[PDB]
């Protein structure tokens, strides 16, 4: 089972893809997201992607299909070792503190064009000792339920 907070976060995530609010992600909407992240999938490629997570074969991703796909992806970052690997990706200079510049670098390389302000907000939410950066223990806390 997922936290009710995790399910709530996944709902907001789902809303970013389901731009029309119809309860489904279409090739058009997934295309729009992929293009915002700097990819150019063809209509064929977009249908291939939906197809593998489309349990009822209706050609769109509903929230239950999305949540199944996301819960499965979360297994890539659930072990001590996978969380350490993810920490090393973020902490580019190896000094044990994920800075705003580092978090923006990771997110930009993944295609997400964030504002300084969005980056500062994600740090603020993770930054428990309030030093303006995210350390390993903060990172583990933010990566587990």
């Amino acid at each position: 089972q997922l936290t009710e907070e995790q399910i709530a976060e996944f709902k907001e995530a789902f809303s970013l893809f389901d731009k029309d609010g119809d309860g489904t992600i279409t090739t058009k909407e997934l295309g729009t997201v992929m293009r915002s992240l700097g990819q150019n999938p063809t209509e064929a490629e977009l249908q291939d992607m939906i197809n593998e997570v489309d349990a009822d074969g209706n050609g769109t991703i509903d929230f239950p299909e999305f949540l199944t796909m996301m819960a499965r992806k979360m297994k890539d970052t659930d072990s001590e070792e996978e969380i350490r690997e993810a920490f090393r990706v973020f902490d580019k200079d190896g000094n044990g503190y994920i800075s705003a510049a580092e978090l923006r670098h990771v997110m930009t390389n993944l295609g997400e064009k964030l504002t300084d302000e969005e980056v500062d907000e994600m740090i603020r939410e993770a930054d428990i000792d309030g030093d303006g950066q995210v350390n390993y223990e903060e990172f583990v806390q933010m990566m587990t339920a």
Partner: peptide, 28 residues
């Protein structure tokens, strides 16, 4: 940024999986 990260890496892996398919075809 936990969920944001797994979504963005999932978007990237949807893309690598589709590239890997066409690559499988080139190789075979």
């Amino acid at each position: 940024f936990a969920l944001r990260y797994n979504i963005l890496t999932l978007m990237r892996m949807l893309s690598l999986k589709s590239l890997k398919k066409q690559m499988k075809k080139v190789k075979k």
